Amino acid sequence: FFHHIFRAIVHVAKTIHRLVTG
């Protein structure tokens, strides 16, 4: 469980910077 959160979290910023960067 605690592992998933750590995955979704980084995924947010990661993708964000991905969708925000292009």
Side-chain angles (χ1 to χ4, degrees):
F1 189 57
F2 241 107
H3 229 215
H4 293 165
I5 305 118
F6 194 102
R7 315 228 250 100
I9 289 183
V10 55
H11 260 242
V12 191
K14 190 55 49 184
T15 321
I16 270 304
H17 246 39
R18 199 227 70 110
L19 277 151
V20 163
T21 290

